[PDB]
Design a protein around this ligand. Structure first.
Ligand code: ADP
Lengths: 397, 199, 99
């Protein structure tokens, strides 16, 4: 619980790699001090449930682990969040999650921003406020969660007048530019959650997608191991309570004994496999780790090539490329590859995928490039491949 | 300030003999305080004779109702005023220490025939809550009194709990001391959320 | 800003109503995060508070290192520590209740 609370309260502004570094530092310190915390805790799963996760997925949320951690932060928060989102997916998710509670949308530059504020405050309506760069100081009494008690009410001093707090007024601040800084007073009273993609986040995305496409057996097996923590344990609780219900309903009618025996056998079999799943918890980890390590160079190459494409803006203003463009390139080379049919080796398909990735990326990028910089992009791609490949000196000097 | 010190120590003849040593120690420390803590380090490291005037004024206010005070009490008041004037605005712990050892060594050098009561009583806390006048108080008695006052204040208004660690007590004493005088304008500077508005 | 002993004291006081295990708890601590730690081997509660203040110190160190490698860091305040303590209390109570 200490590790989970530290992750929720502090982490959220940093990217995936920095979050992992902080988590492993805290875990190493905790295990050094002989504080009993379960090892290999999946903070994504330990702080949520299967139904909530699938509802998030169905409510327009990406399948990335970073997005699930951000959703966890958006659910378990004591200070109202400031969603940093270069894209628009986070706002779509926050509307889809609070649609039933008539979530009102507004902006800090809206002339009727104030009216929309006490309007939601009076009736306990969740409010999504965007464009937080032009921050309104009038929210200071709200963000601080200051309350005054009078006659059994809870009043807030929204300006000179007073408005009742109402049961649930949850506000969501947000922006769209990742490269913005705020004064520390605002930063102290707000929970920072960041949706910005980086090298590590895109590397994780590409690794997950390539493990989903190629070698689906390992991907689900890793999913089974991750769900082994609480999902199966919780799942069999329903069968146990249904057994209790059947026992009280039958009132000891052994006459249709096979009936109860049926579910009894179930409570046997699904137990054993779960216990069985406990046994190979370790040995599966090295298998999944090795399979992931096999596909790691492709993910690193994907991250490097995408960030090279993004940074290609500095040569010429015409070289503008979006993350969706590289995602389309990756999906085209992974699912629409003419060279991948008729070959099934799990080690040649990877090489074909890498080669075709580089080739199709060059083809799709150079067509929007003048015929005096194709050599530059090809050289950058060759250097990226040389860094990625194993068995060759880097020639850094 | 030699004239000011002699007139200030007229409240009792047992302290007049030390007027010249007190002035010399007061000037020496100031010179050292002006030698270091230059402008180009932080934008508020200025030290004018206004600090000396505030020094002798505070000492005179502390000695106004007190009578028959030994020399060590006068040195304690002098050290307390020096701390409250020349190290409240310091921004790093190393300079706070530098000030502490330097005030200690200046007092030792200019007063080599005194007890070291201030050394053991390093906190050097003065308050007028427990006693009517401005008598130095113990850390724990002040903490208990502030705890009782906070217990009353919780139900009085702003029912938010606070913990009483030593820096809170020091800051409360400083702000009360500033609020006493009928010109007190305060500028609390620090990280947002450390307890400026609350205290 | 709050010092290490202030952080330890506020963590100790706010985590008082946390009915912590305090088991046998072998203590190979060796962590001098706070120098006012008990010379006798600290209990589970005090070790948890020390770990909390150590987490805060690590966040400060991480911010410093990030600022070294090209800025893009955001200030951490004692309000962050208070929120962390409140999250710890609420989450621990919720987890213990369901178990
Ligand atoms: N000594 C203290 N003990 C416990 N909590 C404190 C203390 N000082 C400040 N706080 C916390 O800080 C919050 C208020 O901070 P505030 O005084 O507004 O900071 P600032 O003055 O920098 O704006 C309160 O919720 C309170 O819990």
């Amino acid at each position: 619980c200490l590790l989970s609370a530290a992750f929720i309260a502090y982490a959220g502004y940093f990217d995936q790699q920095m979050r992992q570094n902080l988590f492993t530092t805290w875990s190493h310190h905790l295990q050094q001090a002989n504080i009993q915390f379960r090892t290999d805790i999946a903070r994504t799963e330990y702080l949520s449930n299967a139904d909530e996760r699938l509802r998030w997925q169905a409510s327009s949320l990406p399948a990335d682990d970073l997005c699930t951690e951000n959703a966890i932060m958006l659910k378990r928060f004591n200070r109202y969040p400031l969603i940093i989102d270069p894209s628009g997916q986070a706002t779509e998710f926050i509307m889809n999650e609070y649609k039933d509670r008539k979530i009102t949308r507004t902006s800090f530059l809206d002339d009727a921003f104030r009216k929309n504020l006490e309007s939601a405050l009076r009736f306990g309506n969740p409010l999504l406020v965007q464009d937080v760069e032009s921050y309104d100081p009038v929210l200071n009494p709200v963000l601080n969660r200051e309350v005054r008690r009078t006659g059994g009410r809870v009043l807030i001093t929204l300006g000179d007048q007073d408005i009742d707090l109402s049961p649930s007024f949850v506000i969501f601040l947000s922006t769209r530019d990742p490269t913005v800084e705020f004064p520390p007073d605002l930063c102290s009273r707000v929970t920072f959650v960041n949706f910005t993609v980086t090298r590590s986040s895109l590397q994780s995305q590409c690794l997950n997608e390539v493990l989903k496409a190629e070698r689906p057996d390992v991907d689900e097996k890793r999913s089974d191991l991750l769900k082994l923590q609480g999902e199966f344990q919780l799942r069999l609780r329903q069968l146990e309570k249904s057994l209790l219900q059947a026992l009280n309903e039958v009132k000891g009618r052994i006459l249709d004994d096979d009936t109860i025996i049926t579910t009894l056998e179930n409570l046997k079999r699904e137990a054993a496999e779960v216990t069985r799943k406990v046994e190979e918890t370790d040995i599966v980890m090295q298998e999944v780790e090795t399979v992931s390590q096999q596909y790691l160079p492709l993910s690193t190459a994907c991250s490097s090539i995408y960030f090279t494409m993004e940074s290609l803006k500095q040569i010429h203003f015409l070289y503008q490329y979006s993350l969706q463009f590289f995602l389309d390139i990756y999906h085209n080379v992974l699912y629409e590859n003419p060279n991948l049919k008729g070959v099934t080796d799990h080690t040649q398909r990877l090489s074909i995928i890498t080669k075709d990735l580089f080739q199709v990326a060059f083809n799709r990028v150079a067509r929007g490039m003048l015929h005096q910089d194709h050599i530059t992009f090809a050289m950058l791609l060759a250097r990226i491949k040389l860094k990625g490949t194993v068995g060759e000196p880097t020639y850094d000097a | 300030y030699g004239t000011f010190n002699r007139a200030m120590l007229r409240l009792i003849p047992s302290l007049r003999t030390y007027a010249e040593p007190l002035t010399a120690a007061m000037v020496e420390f100031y010179t050292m305080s002006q030698e270091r803590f230059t402008q180009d380090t932080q934008p508020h490291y200025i030290y004018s004779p206004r600090e000396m005037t505030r020094w002798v004024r505070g000492i005179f206010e502390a000695l106004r109702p007190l009578e028959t005070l030994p020399v060590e009490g006068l040195i304690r008041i002098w050290a307390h005023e020096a701390l409250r004037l020349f190290q409240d605005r310091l921004v790093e712990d190393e300079e706070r220490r530098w000030t502490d050892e330097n005030i200690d060594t200046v007092a030792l050098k200019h007063f080599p025939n005194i007890d070291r009561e201030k050394a053991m009583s390093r906190p050097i806390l003065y308050s007028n809550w427990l006693s009517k006048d401005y008598i130095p108080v113990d850390q724990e008695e002040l903490r208990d009194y502030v705890k009782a006052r906070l217990k009353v204040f919780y139900e009085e208004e702003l029912d938010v709990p606070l913990v009483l660690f030593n820096e809170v007590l020091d800051h409360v004493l400083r702000i009360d001391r500033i609020f006493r005088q009928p010109q007190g304008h305060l500028l609390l500077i620090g990280v947002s959320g450390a307890g400026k508005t609350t205290l | 800003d709050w010092s290490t002993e202030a952080l330890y004291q506020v963590g100790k006081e706010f985590t008082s109503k946390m009915d912590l295990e305090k088991p046998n708890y072998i203590v190979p601590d060796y962590m001098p995060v706070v120098y006012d730690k008990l010379p006798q081997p600290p209990s589970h509660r005090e070790a948890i508070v020390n770990s909390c203040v150590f987490v805060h110190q690590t966040l400060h160190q991480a911010n410093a290192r990030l600022a070294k490698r090209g800025g893009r860091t955001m200030a951490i305040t004692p309000r962050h520590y208070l929120d962390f303590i409140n999250h710890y209390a609420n989450l621990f109570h919720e987890k213990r209740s369901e178990l």
